[PDB]
Amino acid sequence: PSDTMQTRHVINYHTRSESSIENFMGRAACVYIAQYATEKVNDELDRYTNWEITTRQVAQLRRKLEMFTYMRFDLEITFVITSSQRTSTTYASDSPPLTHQVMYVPPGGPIPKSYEDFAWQTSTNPSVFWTEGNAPPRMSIPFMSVGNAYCNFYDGWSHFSQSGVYGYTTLNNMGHLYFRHVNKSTAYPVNSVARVYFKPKHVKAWVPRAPRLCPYLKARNVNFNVQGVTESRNKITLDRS
C-alpha cells in the first residue's frame, strides 16, 4: 500500500506563506541539552553547567541558517527541565521542591568558574528561578550584536592583518547560559536535564548563499571532505520505450 508520489490536479490558489523567512526560520528547535546534578559526581557532571550560545551545533538548524550571509533575529529561549534520581541503594526521602536557576550572561558579563561563585548574584546577569512541576520557564533575548547583523560567514581573520584565527569574529557573541540548582542539597543525589529550545523571531535575511553539499566536520569551521555534486546513475539516456 506504499508508496507513490502523484501529480494530483490542484485548483489555482498559489500559497507562498510557508516559504517566508519567518515561517522558514521561526521554528522551535532544540539547540542544547544541559546535564547537571544536585551533587557532584565528576568533573563532567557537576553542580552546574554552561553553554555559550551558538547556532552552529545543530546541523538541521545550521544549514537553514547558512543559506543567507547576514541574519538578524530575536531569540525566544524556553527550557524543559526534568529531574531523576541516581541509581542509589535506597530512594526513600521527603524532598522539598527543587528550584533551578538559569542565568543568562551577556557579552561583557562575568561568568561563574565554580559553584558558590559571586557571578550567580550579579544584578546585570538576568536569572530565572523555576520550581519543578510548573509551566516551563521562558526567556527572551533581543538582537545582541554590536554590528548591524549576525554573519554566518566571515571571510577574514581576527588578529594582526593576516594573523589570528580564520573565520572567527566577535560580532556573533550572543552570551552564555548557566544552569544550577538553587537548593543546597538533597538526601540522595538527583540528576537534571535541561533541554534548550530556540525560536528565532522577527527574522531578516540578506545575500542568499548556496546550500551546503558536504557534511559538517567542525562546529567552528567550514571545513569539508570533497563529495560528488549529486548521486550517480548508469546512463545519461533513457530506455523502455
Binding site: 548556496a210 567550514v222 571545513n223
Partner: protein, 247 residues
Amino acid sequence: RVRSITLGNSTITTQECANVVVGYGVWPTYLSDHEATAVDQPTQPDVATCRFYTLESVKWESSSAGWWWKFPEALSDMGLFGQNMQYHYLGRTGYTIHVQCNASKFHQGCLLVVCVPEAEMGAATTDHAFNHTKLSNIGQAMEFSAKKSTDQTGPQTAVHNAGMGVAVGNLTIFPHQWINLRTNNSATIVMPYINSVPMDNMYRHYNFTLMVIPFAKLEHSPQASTYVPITVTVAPMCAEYNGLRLA
C-alpha cells in the same frame, strides 16, 4: 560599436551593450552625508582613487580548473588605493569588474564569472589551519584544481566543491555572468559594498571573492593558440575611509 571609458588614466575600451550586471540591483554609493557631531567622520580618497587597475592575465588552457581573487586584498600594491589601505584603519568601497577573454572564432568553451560575498573557504587537511598566502597573494591569481588537495597548510581547491563545500552549479544566486565564446567574450559585474558593518579593516577582511570557473572546457585545433588570455580589470568606485584629523 565600441566605446572608450576613461577614469583619470588610462582609457579602456568596451562594446556598446556588454551586458552589465549590477550586484543586487544596488549601485555603489556613499554614506548619504549624515556625518554629524564629528565622532565617526569619514574621508574620501582625494577624490579619487577611481581608476582602472588591470591585473596580470591568466592563461586558460584546456585543463584549467579555474581561478580566484580575494578583494580588497588583490589591490594591495596598486597605486593610491594600495596606500590608503595602510594609511587608514577602516574603509569601504564598491567595484566595477571587467573580465575579457581574448579568444578567436575557432575556440570554444564557457566561463562562469562569479562574485561571492564572504567566500569563507575550508582547509584541505581538515583539523589544520592554513597559511594566508595560500588564500590570496598580493595581486596573484590563486587557481583551483581538478583533483582534491592534500596540502597540509592550504585550502581545498577541488573545483566541483568550489572551496566552500557547496555544489559549483549553484553559484548563480551570487552576482554572475556567463562568458560563452560562441556568443560573448566579456563580463561586467558592478559590486557594491556588502558587509554587516558600514566600515571594516581592509587588510583583515575579504569582502568578496571573484571566481572565474570554466564549465565547458577550452577546446580547439592543435594549430590554434593554446592559452587564450583572460584579463581582469578592476576600478574601485565610491571608496571611503575614516577621518584622520581632530575635533
